[PDB]
Amino acid sequence: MEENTRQRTENYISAKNQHPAWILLATRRAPLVLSALKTLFEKSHDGIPLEEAIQSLSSILIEHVSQEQYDINQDNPFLQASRELREWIKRRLIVERDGRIFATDALEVAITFVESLDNRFMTSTASRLSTVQREIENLETRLNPNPANRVATLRRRISELERELQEAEAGHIEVLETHQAVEHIRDVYNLASSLRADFRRVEDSWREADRALRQSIIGEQYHRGDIVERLLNDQDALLNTPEGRVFDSFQQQLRQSSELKAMSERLRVILSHPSASDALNRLQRHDLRWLVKRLVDESQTVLQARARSERDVRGFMKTG
Template sequence: MSFLELNARFRRLHKEHAAWRLLRSDNAPLILAFVADLFEEADEIAFGRAKMALDTELEHWREQGVIEVEVNAATYLRQWIQAGWLRELDDQLSKTDACEVALRFCRQLDQRETNATASHLRIVQDAVRDLSVAISPDPAERIQLLESRKAEIQRELDELEAGIVHELSDTEQRERIIEIYQLAAVLTGDFRRVEDEIRQIDQTLRVQMIESGGSRGDVILNLLEQEQLLAASDAGRAFDGFFQLLCDQNRSTELREQLKAILSRPAANNLSEQQARFLGKLMRELSRESGRVFQVRRRTEENLRQFVESGAAGEMRAVDRLLGKLERLAVCFKEADISMRHETSLRLDSGHVKIQSPDAWCLKMPEEQLDTRDVQEHINNATPSETMLRQLHAVQVLAVAEKLRKTLRASRIPLSIAGLVARQPIQAGLEELIAFLRVARAVGATELQGRETVEIKDRNGQRLKAEIPHYLLSAEQFPEQLEELIL
């Protein structure tokens, strides 16, 4: 690639890429420090909680003279969302792929491993060897490569049987465990990139619908033909392949046990507390992140259908035609040499409006006057009646969570709620079933496509059939202390 092509590409990235815009913003250190601290313990934060945290920091920054602009926290958060640094979904904030890239770049500047060359070379050699076997069309060549690997493994087995154990030096252990952490830390960024590409495909489809100019039936037909683009895209295929590996019980169990063994060895002392904690809950975080991608993809498909059914595409097409007509009229004004200062009889009342923030621009609706003439005051009873107590059948959600965790540990495989009900039949009716769903949402269970049907019993022994979302739970999704769950 020539110098001119590289220069054009880098100029475009410098202007358009959200990660580059974040790094060159005036308050980049403050923004990155706040975001890194905010998402240190969780990948999703409620918008209200983030606003309170940022309000506190803004007050400190103004006292220290770091910033002088009187802008509230909600406005800053909205600006960061619009810039592509944060994402909001169901009133929950999360980092985008651009934000992850910027944070990873800054951390690597201060955490460069100059002596990890041997570890990198070993990973490249292993990857090249595996790929050479996988893509070779010659059976004889494959056999030769596999035989050489077999001989290498047999040589190691013979040495172990002879009592010869080659241990890694402290430097090699440090290199390899840090390399494992760095590779694992990139996985969560891959999920952010998948979400961003799904949203980009959603926008592309909407633009195509608006520009198509066809009837609603044609648009619906086009949508049905292109709806599978979300799953057939590079991001969708990559995620599906990743999720299949994640759902492979043998691979997941093997990886989980090996991570526990590594963290129990002295080599784990080379990791910081935060790095060790991240590797300890890696499988749970991957399951939670994959559930988020399923949620984003399902919501995108639903929103596309609503976009078509509501006729919004036709309305936007009409607006686009009107804007085009206005642009042509404006061009005609210029060609006709009509002065923009030409006096007309039109007069518009105008004035000066001072707005501190978008929140101050909200119109206030007058409160309706309530008619309280027939309202009678009653003193509330401090003691509940026996009738009320008989209607209360409390289900202890924390006890339900403990029961579900024990069941999952005993099964050793992920189970849906229907599978859990088959092993732990529900006897308290819909209240206990709702407790199952609350626990699934609290632990971040993966929500699969489709729904499932369960049969339960109420307190009177009557059988009920309920259709519920299809959640997939595993014991690793539960924290050690169940009191940490938000139930």
Template sequence: MSFHELNARFRRLHKEHPAWRLLRADHAPVILAFIADLFEDDNEVAFGRARAALDMELERLREQGSLDSKENAPGYLRQWIQSGWLRELDDRLSKTDACEVALRFCRQLDQRESGATASHLRIVQDAVRDLSVALSPDPGERTAILEARKAEIQRELDDLQAGIVRELSDSEQRERIVEIYQLASVLTGDFRRVEDDIRRLDQSLRIEMIESGGGRGAVILKLLEQERLLADSDAGRAFDGFFQLLCDPNRSTELREQLKTILIRPAAKHLNDTQARFLGKLMRELNKESDRVFRVRRRTEEKLRQFVESGAASEMRAVDRLLGRLERLAVGFKDAAIPLRHDTGLALASGTVKISSPASLRLKMPEEQLHTRGIEAEQNASTPSAAMLEQLHAVQVMQIAEGMRNIVRGSRIPLSVADVLERRPIEAGLEELVACLRVARAVGAAELSGRQTVSIADRQGRRFKAEIPHYLLSAEQFPERLEELQL
């Protein structure tokens, strides 16, 4: 690629790419610091919480004289959403892929110790070895490579059987565990790219529907083709791999247990609190990101269907054709020698406004009258009645979550919701049962095939049976702070 081509490409990225615009924005350190702090514990934050946190920081910066702008917090958040640094869905904010790229760039400037380590070389060597096996068309060559790997594994087994345990040095432990964090920290970027691709797919389909003029059948064929291209993209394949992992309870449980084992080893001392907390809740965050992608995809499909069924595409196509005709007429004015103040002789059929002020507006009164005979005014009571208090036996979901966590932590094996209810019987009826299922879904419990039958009792002591999904719970799925659960 030539110098001029690279120069043109970098100029375009410097002007258009959201990550580059974020890095060169006014008060970029303030924006990056606020976003990094806001999403330190969660990848999704309620808009109201973000607004309150930003209001507090803006007031503090203005008191220090570091900020002159009078813009309020909602205005800043809307600007960041329009700039492509944040995304809003269902009144909740999340980071975009461009924001992740900018934050990762800034963090790596201060983490150069992991730039060139032996663990990097080991990962490259393993990847090259696996690829050489997969690409080799010669069965003998593949056999030789696999036999060498088999001999290496056998030597390790022989050493272990002989009581020889080779331990990693302190520097090797630091390199490898930091490498695991670096690799895991970029996983959410793949979900962000899938989300961006889905939104670009929606936009491109709408544009093509307006420009092509095809029927609904052509639109559906184009949608299927774009879906296939999305699934074949790098981000789509990565998301498919994540989804297969998350849907397999054995693989996801194995990875969760392995991460838990790593974090209790002495090597975990090389991670700071933020890094250790991120690895501890990695599987839960991947579940949340996967659910978000499915919500975005479902919302996009619904809006696209409404766009097709409403006929908005044909209306926009007609407007586009009219604008095209006007542009062609305007271009012809230059050669037609038409003066700018030429009288066209056209008149628009428009009336005059009769209303001089909002106060002159008068609403039509209804013809029917409301009969108020026999109605007596009653003073509102300041204390609740006994009948009202009887209906306020609400279930405390947080207490139920704490009880379920204690039961699961006391077991050496994962438990289903039915197993938990055997140890902690339900005494508040269906409301308490629904709360238990909400807790299971909030912690990301694996849903197995089949259903389970449980026996529960209501507040009057009446017992009945109910069928519930087969959720499998493990202790590491529950966070240390139950307030983090979205119940």
């Protein structure tokens, strides 16, 4: 179907003129801003506290004061850092919340783009194909309700695992050779880092849905009894949308403390293996080490941010 192409060029012009990430990429000074922000946010676990942001960004500016062709300041890198920080906040490129500034979705997309741009270690590893094969196996074996198919699949799986058990008991176990193991480690890190990818998309969806609700509430005559249910129906509608649905399903899955306990104990041993230092440098190694804590903390932050929308009902229904 290509009737939509007329509409698609309009969509792209709109994105070009509005979406902050693309506008940033188009700027003359784009590489400086992107490098500075990447350096700054490489070390964030929560939103970096504002004062730390100002200080470290002043240090980063100092790192590049040599580049006078970019009109870099030469009298107070602290004032320059503060000015640049507020400028970027105005660009909808970083947002203040609880005094701790975070990276909006736009910056995340721009950074992912530019990082993937250059020659480097690539996104996929040699283990990506095996990962996809295992996932396809599970997805197909679970999608069809034919009980004969499921029992046959489990029979062949159990026979294969019995073969493996006999082999291991007899002592022919096999392990990853070094350069296979490093690739698996890197693929694991790349998969894991994608979880953080959308904690910021969800919050923007909450914000826009709440804003739309309040704006439509301008016609106050609607029944507040409708909203006695709309309290839950906002989440329900966004659960028809991928944002609310998948984020809450992710919350439910993540709340299974047993599987998360297994995952953490296994992350610890995988990182304790010698080749971990080969696969990942210090920064990545620490990042993966307590990924679980990162997810828990940031999901808690997202929940406590949606708490404002939870209070939106008390700001609408009550007219004392």
